Amino acid sequence: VKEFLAKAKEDFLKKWETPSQNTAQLDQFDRIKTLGTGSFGRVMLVKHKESGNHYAMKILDKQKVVKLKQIEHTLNEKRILQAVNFPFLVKLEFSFKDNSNLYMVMEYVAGGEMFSHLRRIGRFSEPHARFYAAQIVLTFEYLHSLDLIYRDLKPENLLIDQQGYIQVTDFGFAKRVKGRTWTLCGTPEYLAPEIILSKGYNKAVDWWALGVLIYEMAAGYPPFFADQPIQIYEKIVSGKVRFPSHFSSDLKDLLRNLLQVDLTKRFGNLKNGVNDIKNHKWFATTDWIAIYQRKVEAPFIPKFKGPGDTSNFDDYEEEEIRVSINEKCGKEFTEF
Amino acid sequence: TTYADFIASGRTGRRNAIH
Ligand SMILES: Nc1ncnc2c1ncn2[C@@H]1O[C@H](COP(=O)(O)OP(=O)(O)O)[C@@H](O)[C@H]1O
Ligand SMILES: [Mg+2]
Ligand SMILES: [Mg+2]
């Protein structure tokens, strides 16, 4: 563990300093179906001609990135994603750009969003939630050791793979920062109090968001919800959280230490760091090594009828990919 | 119930980010 994170940092630093660039072209792919939309872009299933592999292609309209003031965030997203390598992070296979758009081509995770299965089933049992939570704990351990904050944990950005394991996607708000940072970004239900209160914040916001995720997985609904974000914010800063009757005492004790408004007391941010979380009683039955090596049997395995099957994804309205004869935002995205 | 209140709320679908 201790020595693995040292070797991992060296490969990351090499790619962080000299990122890959322009490793494919749009005409090398056939576009098939939209897998998902987000706040900023669209992700399509594509097939790579020479090879026949299916991939998931994220498409960002440069003008829309500019209008929403996401230039720096989008450059972080590609720079960080092409440099990381971890069993529970989507792999970036190609990236390129044209006159109008930025493209990131990822491995296709056919099992669908955690969001869809969680809403359909209603809630996950604690052993089921724990299996997923352990993968996120290890993923944040790895990312934080590289000085990375993720800042957008939620079931909509978590994908289930063929073996039933998690793949974290969407590095849109990820940032490499050694001190504090100040950007107000993320999803209202998952925002830590210190973000809302315009305090400088650090990697501890990821551990708060983990608490929210575990709650929502096990309860079926977020700990703080309302119809308008403003009322969500008021509940988050008040810190008062109620637990469902069926939560175990161990689960409630862990969540009280993750959903801790006081930065100095929040698990993950203390002297022992992530080991406070790994050593908690709720994880007593968790074999961290076996999870990392993907040797544990997944509690739920999605159905697949073949390569290119999208049945675990919702349908979306398809739109044409337009490319202008004139280059847009050429040098804003020079390093992409 | 809390579940009923959530399911009747406007934020049961996929959630977008704030910026
Ligand atoms: N590697 C992937 N494989 C399959 N589907 C994906 C992949 N990456 C993203 N998606 C789908 O596309 C959606 C949007 O992608 P994301 O990167 O989260 O875009 P945004 O930043 O706009 O939210 C996700 O919620 C998911 O459904
Ligand atoms: Mg997303
Ligand atoms: Mg995003």
Numbering used by the authors:
A (entry chain E): 15 to 350
B (entry chain I): 5 to 23
Manuscript excerpt for this entry:
The system that we studied in developing this procedure is the catalytic subunit of mouse protein kinase A (PKA), a cyclic adenosine monophosphate (cAMP)-dependent protein kinase involved in the regulation of fundamental biological processes that include metabolism, development, memory and immune response. PKA exists in the cell as a tetramer consisting of two heterodimers, with each dimer containing a catalytic (PKA-C) subunit and a regulatory (PKA-R) subunit. In the crystals used for our study, PKA-C is in complex with a small (20-amino-acid) pseudo-substrate peptide (IP20) from the heat-stable protein kinase inhibitor PKI, which blocks the active site. Most likely due to the room-temperature crystallization conditions, we found that adenosine triphosphate (ATP), which binds with high affinity (60 nM) and is always used to stabilize the PKA-C–PKI complex during purification and crystallization, had hydrolyzed, allowing us to capture the immediate products of hydrolysis: adenosine diphosphate (ADP) and inorganic phosphate.
M all was then refined against experimental data, producing an initial MD-revised structure R i. Lastly, information from the density and MD ensembles was used to remodel the structure by hand, yielding the final MD-revised structure R f. The MD ensemble snapshots can suggest (multiple) alternate conformations for rebuilding the side chain as starting points for further rounds of crystallographic refinement. In applying these steps to the R i structure, the revisions slightly improved the agreement with the data: the final MD-revised structure R f had an R work of 0.1282 and an R free of 0.1765, compared with values of 0.1328 and 0.1777, respectively, for the R i structure. The protein-remodeling step provided a path forward for modeling the extra density near Lys217. We therefore placed a phosphate into the difference density. In the resulting structure R f the phosphate density appears reasonable. Based on the MD snapshot, we revised the model using alternate conformations for residues 163–169 (three residues to either side of Asp166 to accommodate the shift associated with the B conformation). In addition, the occupancies of the alternate conformations for residues 163–169 are consistent with the water occupancies: the protein and water A conformation occupancies are 0.80 and 0.73, respectively, and the protein and water B conformation occupancies are 0.20 and 0.27, respectively. The A conformation in structure R f refined to an occupancy of 0.46 and the B conformation to an occupancy of 0.54; these values are consistent with what is seen in the MD snapshot.
